Nucleic acid binder design. Structure first.
Length: 468
DNA sequence: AAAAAAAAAAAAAAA
């Protein structure tokens, strides 16, 4: 039978590759969102070459001392998650998971010699993200659920703000296990209050399922829900697919039909590109480029025009006529496409980092390396160096040493212990430790009144003292 | 047989 796997990480920082996880929690459920099996919760021991983001710690309320005492090493941490995730017929999901948690999981698997993507697809698996489901529910089919307005009078979609707005036990927020229930409940609510949409959006979580909607040649208009648009637009707009992204295969170039389409008609590509990557604050008295990408593998909400009803339009302040006009102009002018696609054909302006943790997206691993890395998983730690393997991917050697050094220091010899002590010395430089102490010493002189917040800060200094 | 593109910028979620 098929199942839904709700999960939520509590990390030591925002950057998934560079920051480490602190806590993991997950619950297995059926299609009706009824709890199957026991709830899974466990902590991760942070390595001795990393300090947490003090902000993240003020949010999570979990000190490295607690995680070190309670948790397991990252190799086990990854094993337990990979065990749960690889169960056949499992749809893994959470809240804002595609653009955070899943990025963590991928690195956790990447750092600990597990396949970073297989969990999402292999054995009839998939993933889902409820965030845009809530935005789509509010935008398209709000009747039934209470929607919390912001200070400016705009719709908020923070989990804690939702569960409280619909009478659900949201006491003690930012807790791995407490958030999963709050998510499951939020799903259960939308499933009950609005099934059709919930199903549509579910079945249309698939890369190939979305594809069907895209008729680039005919520029068939589609409803697109995304936070990138804006809460004043119900995070919603009509869009038209101009062309497939020239390099990335999972991306497609969408034109915003609500935006002013003059720049595309007037300016050339080279200038448009520069015009696309400019801030609204420092941008002058010009209309911005009404173009964005949609990553069909990142659970984007797409539907056909008629899904967005003229009522729901008037409710969200979206001019249907203006969208219908620009479409006719875009259909009337092919030359617009030519210039647009060329914007996304340019090569990567950023130089790749030499930090092995951040190289996940430097291509896939081969079958030989993929197999050889399994033998590394099966081979016991102590016997890892004795095993002579000829790897192809230069990342593997650096990944290994870090794996063994972080997870199994006691398996290191003298040289390996020394070069690690150097690696650490390069991380915890006086100027790095000062800036940290400055960041703490600032925050304490800011949250001084909050004894709970201070206690957490002090703990970070006491940790920072005993780690170096 | 299949899986991906971090970071310029749009906004708003997550730690």
């Amino acid at each position: 039978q098929s199942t839904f796997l709700f999960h939520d990480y509590e990390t030591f920082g925002t950057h998934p590759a560079l920051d480490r996880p602190a806590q993991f929690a997950a619950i297995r459920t059926d299609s009706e969102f009824n709890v199957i099996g026991e709830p899974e919760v466990f902590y991760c021991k942070p390595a001795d070459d990393y300090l947490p983001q003090p902000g993240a710690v003020l949010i999570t309320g979990i000190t490295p001392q607690e995680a070190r005492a309670k948790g397991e090493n990252e190799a086990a941490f990854a094993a337990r998650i990979h065990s749960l995730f690889t169960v056949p017929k499992t749809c893994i999901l959470g809240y804002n998971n595609v653009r955070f948690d899943d990025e963590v999981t991928r690195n956790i698997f990447y750092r600990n010699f597990y396949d970073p993507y297989a969990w999402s697809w292999q054995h009839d698996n998939s993933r889902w993200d409820l965030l845009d489901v809530m935005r789509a529910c509010y935008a398209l089919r709000p009747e039934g659920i209470n929607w919390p307005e912001n200070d400016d009078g705009l719709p908020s979609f923070r989990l804690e703000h939702l569960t409280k707005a619909n009478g659900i036990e949201h006491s003690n927020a930012h807790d791995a296990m407490a958030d999963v229930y709050a998510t499951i409940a939020m799903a259960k609510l939308v499933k009950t209050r609005q099934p059709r949409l919930f199903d549509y959006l579910f079945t249309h979580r698939n890369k190939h399922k979305l594809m069907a909607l895209i008729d680039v040649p005919q520029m068939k208009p589609l409803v697109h829900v995304s936070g990138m648009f804006g809460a004043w637009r119900g995070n919603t707009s009509w869009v038209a697919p101009l062309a497939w992204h020239p390099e990335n295969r999972n991306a497609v170039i969408m034109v915003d039909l609500a935006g002013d389409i003059s720049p595309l008609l007037e300016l050339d590509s080279d200038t448009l590109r520069e015009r696309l990557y400019t801030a609204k604050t420092d941008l002058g008295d010009n209309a911005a480029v009404p173009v964005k990408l949609v990553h069909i593998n990142k659970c984007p909400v797409l539907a056909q025009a008629n899904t967005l009803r003229p009522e729901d339009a008037d409710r969200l302040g979206i001019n249907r006529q203006h969208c219908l006009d620009n479409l006719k102009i875009l259909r009337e002018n092919p030359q617009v496409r030519e210039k647009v696609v060329a914007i996304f054909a340019e090569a990567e302006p950023f130089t790749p980092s030499d930090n092995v943790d951040a190289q996940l997206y430097n291509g896939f691993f081969s079958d030989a390396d993929r197999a050889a890395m399994k033998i590394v998983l099966e081979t016991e730690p102590r016997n890892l160096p004795a095993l002579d393997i000829t790897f192809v991917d230069k990342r593997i050697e650096k990944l290994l040493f870090n794996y063994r050094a972080r997870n199994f220091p006691g398996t290191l010899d003298y040289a390996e212990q020394q070069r690690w002590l150097e690696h650490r010395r390069q991380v915890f430089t006086p100027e790095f430790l000062q800036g940290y102490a400055d960041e703490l010493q600032m925050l304490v002189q800011q949250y001084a009144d909050d004894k709970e917040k201070v206690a957490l800060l002090k703990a970070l200094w006491q940790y920072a003292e005993e780690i170096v």
